[PDB]
Design a protein around this ligand. Structure first.
Ligand SMILES: *[C@@H]1O[C@H](CO)[C@@H](O[C@@H]2O[C@H](CO)[C@@H](O)[C@H](O)[C@H]2NC(C)=O)[C@H](O)[C@H]1NC(C)=O
Ligand SMILES: *[C@@H]1O[C@H](CO)[C@@H](O[C@@H]2O[C@H](CO)[C@@H](O)[C@H](O)[C@H]2NC(C)=O)[C@H](O)[C@H]1NC(C)=O
Ligand SMILES: *[C@@H]1O[C@H](CO)[C@@H](O[C@@H]2O[C@H](CO)[C@@H](O)[C@H](O)[C@H]2NC(C)=O)[C@H](O)[C@H]1NC(C)=O
Ligand SMILES: *[C@@H]1O[C@H](CO)[C@@H](O[C@@H]2O[C@H](CO)[C@@H](O)[C@H](O)[C@H]2NC(C)=O)[C@H](O)[C@H]1NC(C)=O
Ligand SMILES: *[C@@H]1O[C@H](CO)[C@@H](O[C@@H]2O[C@H](CO)[C@@H](O)[C@H](O)[C@H]2NC(C)=O)[C@H](O)[C@H]1NC(C)=O
Ligand SMILES: *[C@@H]1O[C@H](CO)[C@@H](O[C@@H]2O[C@H](CO)[C@@H](O)[C@H](O)[C@H]2NC(C)=O)[C@H](O)[C@H]1NC(C)=O
Ligand code: NAG
Lengths: 597, 181
């Protein structure tokens, strides 16, 4: 009759009804995503609204049990995940205003239009054309026009909305005892009451700042190399001791440097390994790819596919008229129903995306025995790390030469090694400073340390000091440059893309030692080893039942995220870069600007 | 013995109220079908033709796939404590098979109604069909739903696009007592 025993009684009924309603909602959403019609939209909206209403009613019902008298840890976790008010703690007018400005920001970002100065009836949206000009063009003036106009004709509409969204979200977050909206975001990595694995919401800042303090020696050399290579495609525009103009980086924002590969390739006469001709040579189809992926997965000690995965999944694009949004994803409809939705062609990118998606499917199959509220990764940075280590270890030459896609001998040299390592560095290391800087800016904005008359100044000061890029045109306090990013205007967190990159290589080095690898880390293959599978399964099957600082120790041996595995992975490229910059100047000065002349 | 009825009825009962038919040629059941599970406990499965008893009973129901392992002497769970409890001195022999193609309709089959709340654990070979409201807290609810008072039936949501372990599995539990031979 105590206050603890009634919690379990409530949780049982909640679990059952929630499983049922969630399955109905997910089935409706899938039937819409694979077959676009008009009545499917309403048939999906009905189930979605029913599920949301049930969730809201159970949430407002669960407030009767005080989280202080609970003794079990699983019950306490489930209650605390259910008791959270979230939004709707505000008034009604404020909630309507918040939803309106959120939808307005999303719409402004989605359908923003810019057009030419000399032919004003030639307007281009963002996705079909702006991030294509910024991706393939090699003209300085055209890239500058695109980068300036996107921020001058769309970013200027998002500032008076962001200035209100900040205050509204800060109020909503202070209504739940969080001191700001940034602490509400960092509250995901919190762990309390375990006696040995505690983790405050304020230690994430220090951990991030201490793990970024050791990537600077490598990012500096990569920056110097990319600068010395860019001083040849746009002569007399880059200075040998200055930063890089922000429009010569590869895309609209500079998040990924991966489009600079055609300019900064180390050895341009050795083609990187790309087995696409052999697949069409042996006539591989959309099903042999997934058979090979499943074979690789079962090789390490993980179960087969559930046999309900083959008939219900959509592995090929439906032909006649079945307009379908096929963005490769893995579904978890529940009750033992797993499906995959993707438009597979016969290439190598699909051959790796199959492994990436089946990684998510295996993770979902792992923890399917936990209660309903505990079916997720340990935190927001485990799912993608697990899904990425598979595609990391499945694209090696040693693995490709055993399936049959490569010639039997195929001696490997060090030039292609450096080519591959550098192509990997432009995507892995080229985004960590950007992510860290953006999330630091957002934390300082929400916390209240950057008054609303010093937003752009501080943004560009930090972009000059941390990332190492400079703007080509002065931006006063009417612009809002971060708001022109998808994750900033659509209200998504951004610290997961930083911790995922560390967890990925931590897991890879932890598994390389159970498989007893010998050479460098970027030649690892975990296949044909039942120790790596066992170590990984000791963590996959936990879900959110345990604190993440314990699920991490059960694999790597430490509690906090580390940065040594990443440097151990990039060691050879590091030495080569350190010997290619004997004459250049490693570093930058924050005074040179492309307009100060 | 008319085994053609207890194995082939067009509609099987539910777990909380299982149909018990008494009997006043086992080579027809042993040699017939896939039979996903077939375990005989007191008597060896092969010599079922030389030892006979006073009467046999054939209970039946429809439970979920991953709960078949609970129909056994000395088990615990939402099925073996509240709906159907087999004594530790069992002598009969359990059988169960998959029936996904018959007892599952697209859109949900809400006629199978396992019970999940009860004041005490069931005794061996008892049946409880009462439908009173379970009182969780300390304040009586006088037979109405609300807070800390729930409806003790939680009908299965059967569908064809489920996974093995969530599909319907018919069950028959022959139990002997010592005639028919
Ligand atoms: C895609 O959805 C449309 C409509 O939502 C389906 O079109 C009809 O659906 C009804 C539903 O019972 C069927 O009776 C009709 O036969 C369907 N028309 C045709 C021309 O097939 C359509 O079948 C769906 N596609 C798939 C592959 O399920
Ligand atoms: C309350 O806590 C106990 C132990 O602190 C949990 O007992 C576990 O229960 C699961 C399944 O019910 C078993 O697999 C474990 O072996 C049990 N552990 C121990 C140490 O006995 C119990 O599950 C908790 N309550 C709930 C609702 O989860
Ligand atoms: C969640 O929101 C409710 C309001 O909707 C907060 O207020 C408490 O609600 C309970 C439930 O009826 C009342 O019994 C209390 O008197 C309310 N005031 C309190 C507790 O000061 C509730 O505090 C919120 N809880 C959380 C964890 O956000
Ligand atoms: C790849 O390896 C070869 C040898 O295995 C390297 O060639 C030697 O490089 C050193 C260092 O510059 C020279 O002192 C030797 O004279 C070279 N030997 C020959 C036969 O050329 C080559 O430099 C390596 N390439 C990279 C990119 O590391
Ligand atoms: C995993 O191990 C198996 C067996 O040890 C390998 O399968 C054999 O590989 C050799 C190497 O060419 C072939 O000659 C045999 O014909 C293979 N046997 C079978 C039954 O296929 C497999 O290649 C290994 N996989 C990896 C990635 O190392
Ligand atoms: C269960 O009943 C069905 C139908 O009553 C039986 O199906 C019959 O199968 C025989 C062949 O063995 C056919 O000649 C009949 O036409 C079928 N009847 C119908 C209506 O389908 C089935 O044999 C029975 N199974 C058992 C185990 O007795
Ligand atoms: C997986 O399925 C294949 C058949 O395609 C079978 O040969 C193999 O034994 C199965 N492995 C496991 C672990 O179930």
């Amino acid at each position: 009759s105590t206050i603890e025993e009634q919690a379990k009684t409530f949780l049982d009924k909640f679990n059952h009804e929630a499983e049922d309603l969630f399955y109905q909602s997910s089935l409706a959403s899938w039937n819409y995503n694979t077959n676009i019609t008009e009545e499917n939209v309403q048939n999906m909206n009905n189930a979605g609204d029913k599920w949301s209403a049930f969730l809201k009613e159970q949430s407002t019902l669960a407030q009767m049990y005080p989280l202080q008298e609970i003794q079990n840890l699983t019950v306490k976790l489930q209650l605390q995940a259910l008791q959270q008010n979230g939004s709707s703690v505000l008034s009604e007018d404020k909630s309507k205003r918040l939803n309106t400005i959120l939808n307005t920001m999303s719409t402004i970002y989605s359908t923003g239009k810019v057009c030419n100065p000399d032919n004003p009836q030639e307007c281009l949206l963002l996705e079909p054309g702006l991030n294509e000009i910024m991706a393939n063009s090699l003209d300085y003036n055209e890239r500058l026009w695109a980068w300036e106009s996107w921020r001058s004709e769309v970013g200027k509409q998002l500032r008076p909305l962001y200035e209100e969204y900040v205050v509204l979200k800060n109020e909503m977050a202070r209504a739940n005892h969080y001191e700001d909206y940034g602490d509400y975001w960092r509250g995901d990595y919190e762990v309390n009451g375990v006696d040995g694995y505690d983790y405050s919401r304020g230690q994430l800042i220090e951990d991030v700042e201490h793990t970024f303090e050791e990537i600077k020696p490598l990012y500096e050399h990569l920056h110097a190399y990319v600068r010395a290579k860019l001083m040849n495609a746009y002569p007399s525009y880059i200075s040998p001791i200055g930063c890089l103009p922000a429009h010569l980086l590869g895309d609209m924002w500079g998040r990924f440097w991966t489009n600079l590969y055609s300019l900064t390739v180390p050895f341009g006469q050795k083609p990187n390994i790309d087995v696409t001709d052999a697949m069409v040579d042996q006539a591989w189809d959309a099903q042999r790819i997934f058979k090979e992926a499943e074979k690789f997965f079962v090789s390490v000690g993980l179960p087969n596919m559930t046999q309900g995965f083959w008939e219900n999944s959509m592995l090929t694009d439906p032909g006649n008229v079945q307009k379908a949004v096929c963005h490769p994803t893995a579904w978890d409809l529940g009750k033992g129903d797993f499906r995959i939705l993707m438009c597979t062609k016969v290439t190598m990118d699909d051959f790796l995306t199959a492994h990436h998606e089946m990684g998510h499917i295996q993770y979902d199959m792992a923890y399917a025995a936990q209660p309903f509220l505990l079916r997720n990764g340990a935190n927001e940075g485990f799912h993608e790390a697990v899904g990425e280590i598979m595609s990391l270890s499945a694209a090696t030459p040693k693995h490709l030469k055993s399936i049959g896609l490569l010639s039997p001998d195929f001696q490997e040299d060090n030039e292609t090694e450096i080519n591959f390592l550098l192509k990997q560095a432009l995507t892995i290391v080229g985004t960590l400073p950007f992510t860290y800087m953006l999330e630091k800016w957002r934390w300082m904005v929400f916390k209240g340390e950057i008054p609303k008359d010093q937003w752009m100044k501080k943004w560009w000061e930090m972009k000059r000091e941390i990332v190492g890029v400079v703007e080509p045109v002065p931006h006063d306090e009417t612009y809002c440059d971060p708001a022109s990013l998808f994750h900033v205007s659509n209200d998504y967190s951004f610290i997961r893309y930083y911790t995922r990159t560390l967890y990925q290589f931590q897991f890879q080095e932890a598994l390389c030692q159970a498989a007893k690898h010998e050479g460098p880390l970027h030649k690892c293959d975990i296949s044909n080893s039942t120790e790596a599978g066992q170590k990984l399964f000791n963590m996959l099957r936990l879900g959110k039942s345990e604190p993440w600082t314990l699920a991490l120790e059960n694999v790597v041996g430490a509690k906090n995220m580390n940065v040594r595995p990443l440097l151990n992975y990039f060691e050879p490229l590091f030495t080569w870069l350190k010997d290619q910059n004997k004459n250049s100047f490693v570093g930058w000065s924050t005074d040179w600007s492309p307009y100060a002349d | 013995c008319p085994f053609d009825e207890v194995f082939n009825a067009t509609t099987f009962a539910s777990v909380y109220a299982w149909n018990r038919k008494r009997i006043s040629d086992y080579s027809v059941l042993y040699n017939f079908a896939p039979f996903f599970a077939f375990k005989c406990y007191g008597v060896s499965p092969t010599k079922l033709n030389d030892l006979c008893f006073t009467n046999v009973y054939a209970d039946s129901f429809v439970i979920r796939g991953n709960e078949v392992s609970q129909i056994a002497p000395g088990q615990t769970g939402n099925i073996a404590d509240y709906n159907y409890k087999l004594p530790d001195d069992f002598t009969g022999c359990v059988i169960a098979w998959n029936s996904n193609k018959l007892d599952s309709k697209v859109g949900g089959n809400y006629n199978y109604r396992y019970r999940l709340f009860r004041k005490s654990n069931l005794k061996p070979f008892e049946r409880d069909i009462s439908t009173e409201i379970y009182q969780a807290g300390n304040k009586p609810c006088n037979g109405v739903a609300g807070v800390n008072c729930y409806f003790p039936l939680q009908s299965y949501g059967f569908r064809p696009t489920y996974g093995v372990g969530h599909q319907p599995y018919r069950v028959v539990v022959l139990s002997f007592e010592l005639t028919v031979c």
